Each structure stands twice: as C-alpha cells, then as structure tokens.
Amino acid sequence: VNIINNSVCRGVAGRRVGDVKGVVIHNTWTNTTAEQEMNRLAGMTDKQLEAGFAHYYCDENTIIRTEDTYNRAWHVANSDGNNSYIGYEVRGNRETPKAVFLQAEQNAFWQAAEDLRFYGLPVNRNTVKCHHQFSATECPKRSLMEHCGYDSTLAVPAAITVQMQDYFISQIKKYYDNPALKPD
Ligand SMILES: [Cl-]
Ligand SMILES: [Cl-]
Ligand SMILES: [Cl-]
Ligand SMILES: [Cl-]
Ligand code: NA
Ligand code: NA
Ligand code: NA
Ligand SMILES: [Zn+2]
Structure with a gap:
C-alpha cells in the first residue's frame, strides 16, 4: 500500500486540546481515488475547508494523510468529535466494486x-x-x-x-x- 503524507488541510482547525479519544471510520460516498480526494482538498480555500475534511483518505492502493493527527479535523460536525477523534475516509459509494471497497476498508x-x-x-x-x-x-x-x-x-x-x-x-x-x- 502506498503511503502519502501531504497535509493539504493546512491545520486550519488548530491543534487538538486534550487526549485522543479514538477513531471514526467514514466512507466518502464517492468512487474517486484517495489522490483525487487529496487534490480536491488541495484546491480548496481555507474557507472552503470549513465544509469538512478528515485526517486520512484511503482507497484500495493508497493511504493519504491529509491532516497531521495532532491537529483537529472537521469530520463529524460535533466539537468533541472533531477535537478528540481521528477521522479515516474510505473510498466507497454504490458503484465501487466490492473487492476495491473491502481493500480500501482494510487499509483504513x-x-x-x-x-x-x-x-x-x-x-x-x-x-x-x-x-x-x-x-x-x-x-x-x-x-x-x-x-x-x-x-x-x-x-x-x-x-x-x-x-x-x-x-x-x-x-x-x-x-x-x-x-x-x-x-x-
Ligand atoms: Cl463523510
Ligand atoms: Cl467547521
Ligand atoms: Cl446523534
Ligand atoms: Cl462488485
Ligand atoms: Na467526501
Ligand atoms: Na470541504
Ligand atoms: Na470528507
Ligand atoms: Zn462520515
């Protein structure tokens, strides 16, 4: 699996205050690659990042850390969730092939x-x-x-x-x- 560290979310949500409490496993409900997700975030303004982002984007081949895990991420629309839990986005919508989705999940x-x-x-x-x-x-x-x-x-x-x-x-x-x- 390819590992890419590229903090395109720019730390806009600030550093976590307090301890890490856990992880949240998301699905993107898209069928784009992790790199496509990374490029999309890289092209957003810091204002546009207010709509949400996670710490990692994973597909069947790749894990991309788009935000350093010491920072918050705007991934669950809840202050304690965004502060205390690390967010993992798995490539997956209705069109994603079963084996691709399942591999992406395992990577996450x-x-x-x-x-x-x-x-x-x-x-x-x-x-x-x-x-x-x-x-x-x-x-x-x-x-x-x-x-x-x-x-x-x-x-x-x-x-x-x-x-x-x-x-x-x-x-x-x-x-x-x-x-x-x-x-x-
Ligand atoms: Cl989501
Ligand atoms: Cl926000
Ligand atoms: Cl609820
Ligand atoms: Cl299938
Ligand atoms: Na998404
Ligand atoms: Na966004
Ligand atoms: Na997202
Ligand atoms: Zn989600």
Missing part, C-alpha cells in the same frame, strides 16, 4: 490500528466510532450495507450501530495486536 483499519497503538488506546466501543454517533448522517453507508446489511435512509438503529462498531473493532484489533501484519 490498518492505519487506525497504527494510530490507536501509537496513542496507547484500547480498541473497543469507546475508541472506535461511527460518524452517525456524533451527528445525523447515513455514514459509513457502504460499510453499513456490506457488513450489517443496512441500506437505508432511516436513522441507524442503535443495535446496528453496535454491530458496525464491533465489526470495525474486530478488524482494527487484528492489526493493532499484530503490528507486523500488512493490510494487503
């Missing part, structure tokens, strides 16, 4: 495990969260369809949220506990 899980291990956090329901636990959204919609069978515009039910967390936790913990394991 591997990077999330690296960061949880670095900050010394456990891998559990406190530290692995979904965007819709912070604010109203269907995200992570493709993960929800693939792993929970939930393809809907209704607000994600609590039992499905827990199931999606547990899936994310199982994948992240596999990398967390096995530091030499690679996502490909």
Whole structure:
C-alpha cells in the first residue's frame, strides 16, 4: 500500500486540546481515488475547508494523510468529535466494486490500528466510532450495507450501530495486536 503524507488541510482547525479519544471510520460516498480526494482538498480555500475534511483518505492502493493527527479535523460536525477523534475516509459509494471497497476498508483499519497503538488506546466501543454517533448522517453507508446489511435512509438503529462498531473493532484489533501484519 502506498503511503502519502501531504497535509493539504493546512491545520486550519488548530491543534487538538486534550487526549485522543479514538477513531471514526467514514466512507466518502464517492468512487474517486484517495489522490483525487487529496487534490480536491488541495484546491480548496481555507474557507472552503470549513465544509469538512478528515485526517486520512484511503482507497484500495493508497493511504493519504491529509491532516497531521495532532491537529483537529472537521469530520463529524460535533466539537468533541472533531477535537478528540481521528477521522479515516474510505473510498466507497454504490458503484465501487466490492473487492476495491473491502481493500480500501482494510487499509483504513490498518492505519487506525497504527494510530490507536501509537496513542496507547484500547480498541473497543469507546475508541472506535461511527460518524452517525456524533451527528445525523447515513455514514459509513457502504460499510453499513456490506457488513450489517443496512441500506437505508432511516436513522441507524442503535443495535446496528453496535454491530458496525464491533465489526470495525474486530478488524482494527487484528492489526493493532499484530503490528507486523500488512493490510494487503
Ligand atoms: Cl463523510
Ligand atoms: Cl467547521
Ligand atoms: Cl462488485
Ligand atoms: Cl446523534
Ligand atoms: Na467526501
Ligand atoms: Na470541504
Ligand atoms: Na470528507
Ligand atoms: Zn462520515
């Protein structure tokens, strides 16, 4: 997997105050490459970045760190979420091929495990969260369809949220506990 560190989000949200609390696994609900996502952010004004961005963008081949993890990111429309949780964007919409989406997901899980291990956090329901636990959204919609069978515009039910967390936790913990394991 190609690793690219390029902080195109320019630190506009400022440094995190306080400890890291966990990670949020997003889906872009687009079918663009991680590099296309990076270029899109690089071409925005700092005002346009106010619409939102994450710390990493991942596709089947690439992990791009678009914001240093010591900075906040405007990724969940919630102040404590934006301050305390690191955001991972997985390439994935309805058109993305299954195997491409699943590889992209694994790349994000591997990077999330690296960061949880670095900050010394456990891998559990406190530290692995979904965007819709912070604010109203269907995200992570493709993960929800693939792993929970939930393809809907209704607000994600609590039992499905827990199931999606547990899936994310199982994948992240596999990398967390096995530091030499690679996502490909
Ligand atoms: Cl999103
Ligand atoms: Cl904002
Ligand atoms: Cl397919
Ligand atoms: Cl909510
Ligand atoms: Na997006
Ligand atoms: Na934006
Ligand atoms: Na985004
Ligand atoms: Zn999201």
